[PDB]
Structures are given as structure tokens and as C-alpha cells.
Amino acid sequence: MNMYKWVPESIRDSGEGQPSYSNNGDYAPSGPWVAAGIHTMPQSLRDSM
Amino acid sequence: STAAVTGQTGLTITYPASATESAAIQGTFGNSAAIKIKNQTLTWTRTPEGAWSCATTVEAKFKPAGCAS
Amino acid sequence: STAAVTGQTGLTITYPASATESAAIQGTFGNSAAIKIKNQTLTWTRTPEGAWSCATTVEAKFKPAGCAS
Amino acid sequence: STAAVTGQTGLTITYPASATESAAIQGTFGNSAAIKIKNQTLTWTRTPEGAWSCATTVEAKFKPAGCAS
Amino acid sequence: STAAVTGQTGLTITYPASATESAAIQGTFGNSAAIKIKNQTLTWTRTPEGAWSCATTVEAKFKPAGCAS
Amino acid sequence: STAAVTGQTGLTITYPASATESAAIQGTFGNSAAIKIKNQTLTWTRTPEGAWSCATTVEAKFKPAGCAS
Amino acid sequence: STAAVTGQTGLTITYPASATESAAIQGTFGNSAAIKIKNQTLTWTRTPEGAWSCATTVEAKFKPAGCAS
Amino acid sequence: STAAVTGQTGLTITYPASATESAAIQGTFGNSAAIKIKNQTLTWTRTPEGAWSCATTVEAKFKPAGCAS
Amino acid sequence: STAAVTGQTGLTITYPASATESAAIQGTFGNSAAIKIKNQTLTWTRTPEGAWSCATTVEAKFKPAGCAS
Amino acid sequence: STAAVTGQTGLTITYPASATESAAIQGTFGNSAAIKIKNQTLTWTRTPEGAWSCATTVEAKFKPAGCAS
Amino acid sequence: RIDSSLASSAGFVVAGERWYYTKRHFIIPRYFQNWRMRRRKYVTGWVMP
Amino acid sequence: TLIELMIVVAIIGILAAIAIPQYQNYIAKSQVSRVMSETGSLKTVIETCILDGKTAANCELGWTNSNLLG
Amino acid sequence: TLIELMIVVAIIGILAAIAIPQYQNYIAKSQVSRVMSETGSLKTVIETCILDGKTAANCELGWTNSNLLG
Amino acid sequence: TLIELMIVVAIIGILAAIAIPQYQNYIAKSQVSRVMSETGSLKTVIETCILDGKTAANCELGWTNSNLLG
């Protein structure tokens, strides 16, 4: 039975993540943001997710 | 003018050396530039995936719409 | 030049010596190739029964439909 | 960034899954748009027969010559 | 200082929030202004179309040529 | 793969069982084929006298001179 | 506000209909203009070649260096 | 859209029905074209031997290097 | 108006004849220009390698920032 | 036209009359070519073994990727 | 790339779509597409032990 | 220099309005031709099998999988 | 007027802010497409060499050096 | 005011000093690229004539005059 199935443990951190620094400089859900590079996140959090 | 060394001291080119480096063209203002931005920098960063974007360290008011991060 | 040795460093021919050994023609990107796809290899492997197929290690979006794994 | 899902909110794509449905690229103005054009839309209509056409909901004056219909 | 909040209490600007309302810059006389014209206002309003016009509440004799109602 | 059964489901072989019926080699597009002609078929029919000819279900603008019947 | 019908009577547009006629933008003074130049006119004309020139019927002493013709 | 019957009135196709007559592709400007070149024509002619050339009826300054003849 | 001779004698064009000579576009003030700079010239030169630079004989205090040479 | 003589003066063909001499297809720029590369040459050389390669006298800045020799 | 949500929100500070991994910067799992994934066709058959 | 930037926008607007040729026929015509060669290459196998008298099962086919399913 | 010149500054700000379509993906595909055609042409000589039984050293290869290292 | 007009003049002078990005290199590479295709387009004619054994005059060139003289 042909069956498309997702493949776990074959996913990679392709680096497309574009974190945004809110120009408000705080936890405001609104306001302008600064889409930054993936470098700004701790790699531990990346691995956990 | 070559990428390794340019003809202007205010212009620097970050030439990638492998497939994982991110290119950047950095230009430091001066000479005929304003006194306030006599030493500010404007950089166009190029992600290895093929994405071009602009950044600068000068005030947000002074940023144009395109380089508004 | 020859199957045993070629005039190019990046081209290798896997010539079979027996009836049950497959054939493979593999080339490695370099020189004027893109820095992103640099050092990658594309191989055309031949089954002993005479079936030809193509394989490569380049990214999924860069793989042509004729060599998609 | 794929056809199914894009990296920007303002862009959506109708992928034609059959031979009797048309393709369209929808880009909705926003972010740094002009206040009059906060919510107008323009589409790139791709007919199944191989014809490309452009249409917009903006006022007549703002319409460029290539999207007057 | 800013359109939302200004550094002088005698200057106000109405910034539109959508495309169906008008913009306006309003200024009220005071301090060094004459006693007769101490409490009227001069306004610069921008229509939704984007047309700028000047209006004032001062007497007809004190109105300039460009702000004649 | 053989005449009775092939390794590709889009490839169909109609092998005659007597001296009176005709042979047919029918192939159905798909996978890497175009969306418009994703479900069309190209067949090679052979008369009992030994004459080979082609037919196709694609539109006229895609029919080559070989199968333009 | 269009070329065919101007918003006010003081401005008139000569819109050519073919490749041999010349465009002209004529503005007749009045309203708040000086009494001496109440009925004078100022026109911007464009040749079919694509050259702009200025002409005014105001007195010589009132002609600026721009329209010294 | 056929050679005998094209989909646009501004496009003219001369199909050679014999081996001794030439093929030509004539395109007349208009609609959105510049008024100066509103009624000019640009043609591509083919000799029966298979040699292509370009001719244009606009002024020389509007003629590119390709169709300078 | 061609490069060989200009419409007015106050503008001069130096057209290069080979690849080892530099071009020059020189303009001399006058007519409606200031009396104190009635005979100064403003010239644009282009290096054989393709670099454009500006020079002028006017005093430093009248020079723009782009021609301070 | 022919290998012995071509229809364009800037195109020359070196035909091999024997098995121990090479062939050359040399093209000399001009007419619509840039002044900087007005008199440079680009050639195709083929060894008697049948191996083709590219050569030119233009500067390394203008050299294409396939003719860096 | 498609999806990046259904991850560990721990550490992130949720501000609507914004997940502030820092006081200043945030991410949006809707477009935080650093995750390349994999799926495969699967021919399967039910078996009785 | 307001009028100068208009020509920049106008040319871009004109260039963005370039007529895109109907490339769909090119690929579809070419794709069938690839099927044309692939399908006709088995005629020699089919004709030899028919003339030798072998059945459908006895006819050895040197077919290779095609990405176009033809 | 100052309003006219400020607008020109905004236009340059708007015009220079065009999105990059990531031409790296476009270029890389063509190079791979070029290479596979070259390596594809080597199939016939290897196939003919194998069917004749000649050794690897005896199999003459009409391969020409490629700028992409093959 | 005089100061507001001085801002306008300075901006015009600022705009007038935009760097010219040496457009000679770009076109020259492209102009050579077009000629590059022209010279290689006649290789097929020459290769066949050499292999078929035709003489220089017996070889028919399907060459059309190029405005770049290449």
C-alpha cells in the first residue's frame, strides 16, 4: 500500500530562520521589527525545538 | 578596484571563501558626509542561501525605508 | 583520455572488470563551478545489465528532474 | 520558501493542480505602502493555455500601462 | 518632535489612520502673538486625495493672500 | 520487464495472441510530464501485415510530424 | 483634474493629437495677481521633438532670466 | 492565434506559400506606444535561403544598432 | 544637436576616436550666469577605462561638493 | 557563405588542408562593437585530433568564463 | 520548510506570533522556516502476528 | 530631477510589461518527442519477438524507467 | 521646492529596495544541467567499450576538459 | 527663507555626484558573449566538412553578417 509518510530524524536546521527584533525593544506583539540572522538564538534552544 | 582591496578606504568587501560564508559590502561614511555620520557604517549582508538584506548602525530615523531593518 | 586515467582531475571513471560489477562515471564540481555547489559530485552509474542512471549529492532545489533521487 | 507556503504574509500563490484551473500570483500591498494603497491587490493571471495577464484593484490613475485592464 | 506628540502645545497635527480621512496641521497663536490674534488658529489640512490648503479663523484683514478661506 | 508486464505502469504493451489482431505499444505521460498533458497517452500500433504507425491524444499544437494523424 | 478639463479657467492645456502638433501649457494670470498683470498669460510649450521652452507676455522688466524671450 | 489569423491587429505575418517568396514579420506600433512613433512599423524579413534581417521605419536616433539598416 | 557640434557654443563635446584617449564634456558659463564667473568652464571628463570625473576653474567657495578638485 | 571565404570581413576561417595542421575560426570586432574592444580578436582553434578550444586577445576583465586563456 | 511551530515554546516569550527569545528580538514559528524536513512514499502491508 | 526619475520608472514599467511568449507548447512538443524516441525504440524488440514466435511473457524487454512515465 | 527634492530621495529609497529573487538557485541549476549532458555523452563510449570487452586503459575516451571540472 | 533654498541646492549637488559603476565592463562581457555564440555556432559546419572531407570552398557556411563583425 503506497502511502506518503513524513520522515522523522531526517530534518535539518537549514538556517532559513529569520528572527525579528521588535523596534519597540520589548515584548510588544506590535510595532516595527528587525528581521535578523539566525545567529541571535542560543543553539541549545534550537536543538530543543 | 578589486574585491580584496578597493580603491577607497571607506569601502570594504567581504569576499566569501566557502559555501557557508555570508557576503557583506560595508561602506563607512566620511569626507563629504555629514558630521553626525562621519564614522557610521552601512552594510548589505548576503546570506549563503541567496538572500540580500541591508543593515546599518545609525539612528532608525535616519534609515531609509529599504534599509529599515 | 582513457578510462583508466583521464586528462582532468575532477573526472573519474569507475570501469568494471567483471560481468557482475557496475560502471560509474562521476564528476566533481570545481574551478568555475559555483561556490555553493563546489566539491559536490554527480555520478552516472551503469548497472551490469546495461541500465544507466544518474545520481548527485547537490541540494534538492538544485537537482534537475532527470537526476532526482 | 515554496509555492505551497511563502516567507512573506503579503504573497499567496494559487498552484494549478489540474489542466483546467488557472495560476495566479497575489501580492497585497502593506507594511511600507502608501496610505491610499494599504489594502489594494494585484494578481498575475496565468491562463492554462500559456497566457500571462495582469489585473489590479487600484484606481485608474495609479494603473501602469501594463496592467490597465 | 513627533506627529503623535509635539514639543509645543500650540502645534497639533491630525495624522490619518486610514485612506478615507484627511490630514491636518493646526497651530494656535499665543505668547508673542498680538492680543487681538491671541486665540485664533491657522490650519494646514491635507485631503484624502493629497491636496494641501490653508485656513484660519483670524479676521479677514489679518488673513494672508494664500489663506483667504 | 517483458512484453506481457513492464516495469513502468505508464507503459502498456498489447501483444497479439493470433495472426489476425494488431499489436500496440501505448505509453501514458506523467510524473515529470506537463500538467496539461499529464494524463494523455502516446501509442504505437502495428498492423498484422507488419506496418508501424503512431497516434496520440495530445492537442494538435503538441503533435509532432511523426504522429500528426 | 485632467488635461482635457482643467480645474480652473486660469490654466489651459494644449494636448496634441498626433506626432506633428506641439504641446503647450498656458497659464493666464488673474485673481490675486497684480492689477498691471491681471490679464497677462504664461505658457509652457513643448515641441514635437521633445524640447521645452518658455514664453510670457509680461513686461520686459518683469521677465525673469528663465523666460527672457 | 495562427499565421493567417493572428490575435492582434497590430501584428502582421507574411507566410511564404512558395519556395521563391520571402517570409516577413511586420509589427506596427500604436496604442501604448509613443505618439511620435504612433504609426511607425518594425519588420523582420526572411530570405528564402534562411537569412534573417531587421528593418525599422522609426527615425535613426530611435533605431537601435540591431535594426540600424 | 550631435556630439560633433552642439546647439550652443557654450557646450563642447570631446568624442574619443580610439580606446586609448579620454573624452571630455566642457561647459562654459555665460549669458544669464553670474558676471564674476562669466568665462569659467565646467567640464566632465571620462577616462579610457570608463571613469567619469568633474573639474572646473571656478573658485573653491563656489564649487559644489562633487567638483572639489 | 563558404569556409574558404566568408560573407563578413571580420569573420575568417582557417581550413585544415591536411591531417597535421589545426583549424581556426577568427572573428574581429568592430562596427557596432565597443570602442574599447574595437580591434580585439576572438578565435576558435581546433587541433587535428578534433579538440576545440577558445582564445581571444581581449583584457581579462572582459574575458568570458570559457575563454580564460 | 513549511512548518516550524509545534516546537518547545519554553525559553521563548510569546507575544502573539512573536516568541521573544531575547528581551529585544523575537521569532515567528509561522515563518521561522529554518527547518528542512523529509517525507517519503511508503508501500505497506498489514500482517497478523 | 523629478522628471528624470519618471523615465526610470516608465522604462521599468514598460520593461515589466514585456510580452511573455507562450513557452508551454515548446516543452510539451519537446516532451512528446522524447516519448517519441523512447516508445519507438522498443519496436525492434517487439518486431523481433513477434517474428520469432515468442509469446508476451517470452519477449525479453530491455526497458528503462522513464521520468515522464511514457 | 524642498517637497520636490525630498520626494526624489524617497523614490531612490523605494527603487533601490527591490527584492532579490535569489538568482543563486537559478545559476546553480544550469551548471548541473550542463554537467550531466557532458557526463551523459560519456555513456556511449563506455557502453561500446564494455560491449567490446576492452580494458579501462584500452578504452579511448574522447573527453574534453570542462571548465566546471566535469 | 534663504536657508530652505540652500538645502534644495545642496541636495541637487549631492544627487549630481552619484558614482558611475563602470558600465563598460558589463556590456563588454556581454558583447563578447554574443560574439562567443556566433563563433561557436559555425563549429558544427566546420567539423562536418573536415570529417566529410569537403574542401574549404566545398564547405557551405550558413553565416549571416553580424553587426559586431565577429
Author numbering:
A (entry chain a): 1 to 49
B (entry chain BD), C (entry chain AZ), D (entry chain BC), E (entry chain BF), F (entry chain AY), G (entry chain BE), ...: 79 to 147
K (entry chain a): 147 to 195
L (entry chain AG), M (entry chain AH), N (entry chain AI): 9 to 78
Published text:
Single-stranded RNA bacteriophages (ssRNA phages) are positive-sense RNA viruses that have shown specificity for gram-negative bacteria by exploiting host retractile pili, including T4P6. Acinetobacters have type IV pili (T4P), which are involved in twitching motility, surface adhesion, biofilm formation, and natural transformation in gram-negative bacteria. Our study delves into the interaction between Acinetobacter phage AP205 and type IV pili. Using cryo-electron microscopy, we solve structures of the AP205 virion with an asymmetric dimer of maturation proteins, the native Acinetobacter type IV pili bearing a distinct post-translational pilin cleavage, and the pili-bound AP205 showing its maturation proteins adapted to pilin modifications, allowing each phage to bind to one or two pili.
